Design a protein around this motif. Structure first.
Motif, PDB file in Angstrom:
ATOM      1  N   UNK A   1       4.800  49.396 -37.266  1.00 19.33           N
ATOM      2  CA  UNK A   1       5.829  48.890 -38.189  1.00 19.33           C
ATOM      3  C   UNK A   1       7.235  49.217 -37.723  1.00 19.33           C
ATOM      4  N   UNK A   2       7.394  50.338 -37.029  1.00 19.83           N
ATOM      5  CA  UNK A   2       8.722  50.695 -36.476  1.00 19.83           C
ATOM      6  C   UNK A   2       9.124  49.687 -35.400  1.00 19.83           C
ATOM      7  N   UNK A   3       8.164  49.263 -34.584  1.00 19.67           N
ATOM      8  CA  UNK A   3       8.463  48.203 -33.585  1.00 19.67           C
ATOM      9  C   UNK A   3       8.660  46.870 -34.312  1.00 19.67           C
ATOM     10  N   UNK A   4       7.970  46.673 -35.433  1.00 15.95           N
ATOM     11  CA  UNK A   4       8.199  45.456 -36.249  1.00 15.95           C
ATOM     12  C   UNK A   4       9.624  45.472 -36.817  1.00 15.95           C
ATOM     13  N   UNK A   5      10.132  46.651 -37.190  1.00 17.78           N
ATOM     14  CA  UNK A   5      11.464  46.746 -37.838  1.00 17.78           C
ATOM     15  C   UNK A   5      12.587  47.030 -36.838  1.00 17.78           C
ATOM     16  N   UNK A   6      12.298  47.020 -35.534  1.00 21.84           N
ATOM     17  CA  UNK A   6      13.395  47.160 -34.540  1.00 21.84           C
ATOM     18  C   UNK A   6      14.295  45.940 -34.741  1.00 21.84           C
ATOM     19  N   UNK A   7      15.619  46.107 -34.932  1.00 22.81           N
ATOM     20  CA  UNK A   7      16.500  44.982 -35.281  1.00 22.81           C
ATOM     21  C   UNK A   7      16.505  43.785 -34.325  1.00 22.81           C
ATOM     22  N   UNK A   8      16.460  44.019 -33.010  1.00 24.54           N
ATOM     23  CA  UNK A   8      16.346  42.869 -32.074  1.00 24.54           C
ATOM     24  C   UNK A   8      14.983  42.197 -32.262  1.00 24.54           C
ATOM     25  N   UNK A   9      13.935  42.994 -32.452  1.00 19.76           N
ATOM     26  CA  UNK A   9      12.597  42.418 -32.734  1.00 19.76           C
ATOM     27  C   UNK A   9      12.572  41.843 -34.156  1.00 19.76           C
ATOM     28  N   UNK A  10      13.340  42.430 -35.071  1.00 19.88           N
ATOM     29  CA  UNK A  10      13.363  41.978 -36.484  1.00 19.88           C
ATOM     30  C   UNK A  10      13.966  40.573 -36.603  1.00 19.88           C
ATOM     31  N   UNK A  11      15.011  40.300 -35.832  1.00 19.34           N
ATOM     32  CA  UNK A  11      15.634  38.956 -35.865  1.00 19.34           C
ATOM     33  C   UNK A  11      14.991  38.039 -34.815  1.00 19.34           C
ATOM     34  N   UNK A  12      14.008  38.530 -34.057  1.00 23.68           N
ATOM     35  CA  UNK A  12      13.295  37.669 -33.076  1.00 23.68           C
ATOM     36  C   UNK A  12      11.785  37.873 -33.223  1.00 23.68           C
ATOM     37  N   UNK A  13      11.284  37.887 -34.460  1.00 23.65           N
ATOM     38  CA  UNK A  13       9.842  38.135 -34.725  1.00 23.65           C
ATOM     39  C   UNK A  13       8.963  37.002 -34.193  1.00 23.65           C
ATOM     40  N   UNK A  14       9.532  35.813 -34.009  1.00 18.87           N
ATOM     41  CA  UNK A  14       8.757  34.674 -33.461  1.00 18.87           C
ATOM     42  C   UNK A  14       8.415  34.899 -31.981  1.00 18.87           C
ATOM     43  N   UNK A  15       9.176  35.751 -31.288  1.00 22.24           N
ATOM     44  CA  UNK A  15       8.864  36.082 -29.870  1.00 22.24           C
ATOM     45  C   UNK A  15       7.942  37.307 -29.770  1.00 22.24           C
ATOM     46  N   UNK A  16       8.067  38.254 -30.702  1.00 27.23           N
ATOM     47  CA  UNK A  16       7.220  39.473 -30.662  1.00 27.23           C
ATOM     48  C   UNK A  16       6.345  39.449 -31.912  1.00 27.23           C
ATOM     49  N   UNK A  17       5.293  38.642 -31.873  1.00 25.90           N
ATOM     50  CA  UNK A  17       4.441  38.472 -33.075  1.00 25.90           C
ATOM     51  C   UNK A  17       3.463  39.641 -33.261  1.00 25.90           C
ATOM     52  N   UNK A  18       2.679  40.097 -32.264  1.00 20.60           N
ATOM     53  CA  UNK A  18       1.885  41.308 -32.446  1.00 20.60           C
ATOM     54  C   UNK A  18       2.592  42.546 -31.875  1.00 20.60           C
TER      55      UNK A  18
END
Lengths: 199, 91, 184
Positions: C136-153
């Protein structure tokens, strides 16, 4: 902090002072020159490129206050780009204004050691109000004014503290907040210790 | 055809790093002498800082000798209190 | 000031390998892109010397402080203290032996990992720490948070620390003076 059961209390006949200095950390980053740093960062990003081949409620916070730092040295609101150190002006002769200067000072117990004495001295100068943390258990400078009255300079830092003038027990008169570039503004009182604080 | 996973891995393998987005920069000596200055900044800053640390080490070495053994015992206690975390860095 | 000399970033993904040849190379390929964004240094497919669980590499390892000019290590520590702390389960302060806190003190068993409940080896040359960042911390990383379509799992990644400072707690305390809730 360990205390030995017995010791030679040579500092009982000699007023060695357990005096500590509050070195405040500067809160925000000082502004570096944007043009030269921008040119240098442009050069490094060019080298990196060629080497590889709430919205209405947010405002960027200003880093400057209207009041200047020189002359008025009362509270914590002058320089966030430089370190400021707590300097106590030496007290009066009979209960008025101050003459010669000094440091936030407290003479050590002949038995109890210097650093915990200085931590207690800057712990009871806040009057049990806010916790002030400490840096080192060994003194930084040595005093050549009196060989018996050689003050040991321990160091401490600011967490959060609204100070009052009527609580420092080292004969407080005023409060001075200056940087290492201007630790010699009291040259009329300080003779040679102001040179040794330049290290 | 391609699934969403296939277009995703195509745009992901192609843009693991962005694929060759740079002009290859050459250099000829018809410039100003800058790399000398570039090493001078870091050498001067790091050397001044390490001279400051070594002079502080000298003072803390010579500090604890005009004083009896209990004062050594307070001075030579090799433990530190945990830091209070309320010390916000350069913003 | 007391500073570090070495640091590593790794994602030990046993979710990628539980078989002889069924390795999730594409899943660790987006994990490699995630580590390139998170670390600040080019990623490496961690080719295992014991590659008996996959056809290709498993996990991604990047060394941020072995090279000179230690900007990458400081940026990694700055990013983790900035945004990677708050989603941790049981985050009310850090006990010094395991530098990431669980929501417990007892029942901290070690089933398939090493038995390092303490800080590290007793001699301590190797300061091996189980700094395990949640998915969840990697899910909530802000660059990953605004680019969740690129980092789905996202997969759980563990960090191991090497400090030049003599004691692990005091060296971690200076970086806890970087506003890291490691006090407890």
């Amino acid at each position: 902090s360990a205390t030995v059961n017995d010791g030679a209390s040579t500092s009982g006949e000699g007023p060695i002072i357990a005096a500590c200095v509050l070195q405040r950390l500067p809160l925000v980053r000082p502004r570096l020159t944007t043009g030269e740093q921008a040119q240098l960062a442009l050069e490094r990003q060019r080298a990196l490129q060629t080497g590889e081949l709430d919205l209405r409620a947010f405002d960027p916070v200003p880093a400057t206050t209207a009041a200047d730092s020189n002359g008025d040295v009362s509270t914590m609101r002058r320089r966030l780009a430089d370190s400021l150190y707590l300097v106590v002006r030496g007290g009066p002769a009979a209960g008025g204004g101050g003459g010669e200067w000094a440091f936030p000072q407290a003479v050590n117990t002949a038995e109890e050691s210097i650093s915990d004495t200085a931590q207690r001295a800057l712990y009871g100068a806040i009057g049990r109000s806010h916790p002030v943390y400490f840096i080192g258990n060994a003194p930084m400078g040595h005093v050549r004014a009196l060989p018996a009255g050689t003050s040991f300079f321990m160091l401490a830092q600011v967490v959060d503290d609204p100070w009052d003038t009527q609580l420092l027990p080292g004969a407080a008169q005023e409060l001075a907040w200056v940087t290492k570039q201007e630790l010699l503004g009291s040259y009329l009182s300080d003779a040679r210790l102001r040179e040794l604080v330049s290290k | 055809g391609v699934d969403e996973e296939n277009a995703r891995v195509k745009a992901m393998v192609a843009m693991l790093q962005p694929p060759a987005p740079a002009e290859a920069t050459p250099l000829t000596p018809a410039e100003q002498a800058a790399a000398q200055q570039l090493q001078q900044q870091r050498v001067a800053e790091h050397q001044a800082w390490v001279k400051d640390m070594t002079t502080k080490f000298k003072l803390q070495q010579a500090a604890l000798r005009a004083l009896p053994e209990r004062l050594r015992v307070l001075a030579m206690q090799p433990d530190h209190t945990p830091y209070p975390l309320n010390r916000k860095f350069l913003f | 000031l007391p500073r570090l000399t070495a640091i590593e970033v790794s994602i030990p993904a046993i979710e990628t390998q539980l078989e002889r040849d069924v390795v999730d190379k594409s899943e660790l390929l987006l994990y490699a892109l995630a580590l390139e964004v998170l670390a600040g240094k080019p990623a490496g497919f961690t080719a295992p010397a014991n590659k008996a669980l996959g056809t290709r590499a498993t996990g991604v390892a990047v060394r941020l402080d072995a090279v000179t000019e230690p900007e990458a290590a400081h940026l990694f520590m700055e990013k983790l203290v900035h945004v990677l702390l708050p989603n941790q389960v049981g985050f009310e302060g850090v006990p010094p032996p395991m530098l990431v806190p669980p929501p417990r003190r007892s029942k901290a068993a070690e089933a398939a990992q090493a038995r390092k409940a303490a800080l590290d080896h007793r001699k301590a040359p190797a300061k091996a720490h189980f700094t395990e960042i949640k998915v969840g911390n990697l899910l909530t990383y802000p660059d990953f948070e605004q680019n969740f379509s690129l980092f789905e799992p996202l997969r759980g990644m563990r960090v191991r620390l090497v400090m030049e400072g003599a004691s692990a707690a005091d060296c971690a305390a200076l970086l806890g003076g970087m506003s890291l809730p490691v006090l407890s």
